[PDB]
Amino acid sequence: MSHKAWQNAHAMYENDACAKALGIDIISMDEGFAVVTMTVTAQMLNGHQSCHGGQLFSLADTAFAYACNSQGLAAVASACTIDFLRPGFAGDTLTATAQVRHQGKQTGVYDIEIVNQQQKTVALFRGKSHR
Amino acid sequence: MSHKAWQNAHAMYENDACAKALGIDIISMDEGFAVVTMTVTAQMLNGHQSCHGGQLFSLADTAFAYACNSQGLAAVASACTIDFLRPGFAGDTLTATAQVRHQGKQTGVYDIEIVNQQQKTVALFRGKSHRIGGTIT
C-alpha cells in the first residue's frame, strides 16, 4: 500500500523531471488521459528547419507516461507506430494528448495526437504499453 | 554508388547537430544502406538505468535519414513503427543498420535494426519515406 503509493510518487517525479528538461507543461490531466504542451525552439530543428522526430517522440512519450501515471499504472512502451502529417516548426506550440484506448492485465494501448497552435494535426501516435 | 552515398552522408553529417550532440557516428554507407553507431551515456538513462525511447528513436531515425537520402534526393519520414526489445544500458554500444526494402520515384520503405555490443537486438524499426522537392541539405 504505502510501497505502491511511494512508487506512484516516484514515477510522477521522474516523469516531471523529463518534462522539465524538455520544457513540457501539463495543461489538463485526469483518469486515463493527459494533455501537455511544448514550444518548439531553434535548438530542436533538423536540417529542414523542423522539429526532428526525436523531439516529437519525447513529447509523445512524456504525455503517455502522464496518462499511465494518472491511474498509478507505470508502464514502458514496447511498440509504437507514428504518422507524421505536418512539420513542427520553430515557435510552434505543440499540444500532445494521450488517452488510454485499452488496458489489459499486463499490457495496454495508448493513443497520442499532437497538434499545433492552429489546431492542425502534426502527428498521430499509437503505442503498446508494458505492465 | 557507395562513393555517392558517402558524399551525401558527409554533406548531411556536417550540419547534423542532433547526431553530433548524441555522439552518433556513420560507419558504413551505400545506396539505400547506412550503418550508424552510438554509445549509451548516463545522460540518456531513465529511472531504471535504461536508455530513453527518445534517444533510441533518434538513433534509428538517423540511420533511416541517411539511408533514404543516400541516393541524393531529399526525403523525409511520413510514418514509422518501432519495437523495443531489450534495454540500452550505459556503456552499451548501439549500432543501427538501415536497409531499403522499397524505393519508388516518390515513396520508400526502409528497415532499421539496432543491435548492442553483445550482438543482441535492442529494437526494430520500419519507416516510410517521402521525397521532397530536390537535393538534400
From Swiss-Prot, chain B:
Covalent S-S links between cysteines: none
Segments crossing the lipid bilayer: none
pH effects: Optimum pH is 7.5-9.
EC number(s) recorded for this UniProt protein: 3.1.2.-
Keyword list, A-Z: Hydrolase
Induction details: Activated by cAMP receptor protein (CRP), integration host factor (IHF) and by phenylacetyl-coenzyme A (PA-CoA) that prevents PaaX from binding its target sequences. Inhibited by PaaX.
GO biological process assignments: phenylacetate catabolic process
Enzyme class: hydrolase
InterPro entries associated with the record: Acyl-CoA_thioesterase_PaaI, HotDog_dom_sf, PaaD, PAAI_dom, Thioestr_dom
Pathways involved: Aromatic compound metabolism; phenylacetate degradation
One of the record's GO molecular function terms: acyl-CoA hydrolase activity
PANTHER family, per database record: ACYL-COENZYME A THIOESTERASE PAAI (PTHR42856:SF1)
Functional description taken from the UniProt entry: Thioesterase with a preference for ring-hydroxylated phenylacetyl-CoA esters. Hydrolyzes 3,4-dihydroxyphenylacetyl-CoA, 3-hydroxyphenylacetyl-CoA and 4-hydroxyphenylacetyl-CoA. Inactive towards 4-hydroxybenzoyl-CoA and 4-hydroxyphenacyl-CoA.
Oligomer and partners: Homotetramer.
Stated family: Belongs to the thioesterase PaaI family.
Protein name (Swiss-Prot/TrEMBL): Acyl-coenzyme A thioesterase PaaI
Gene: paaI
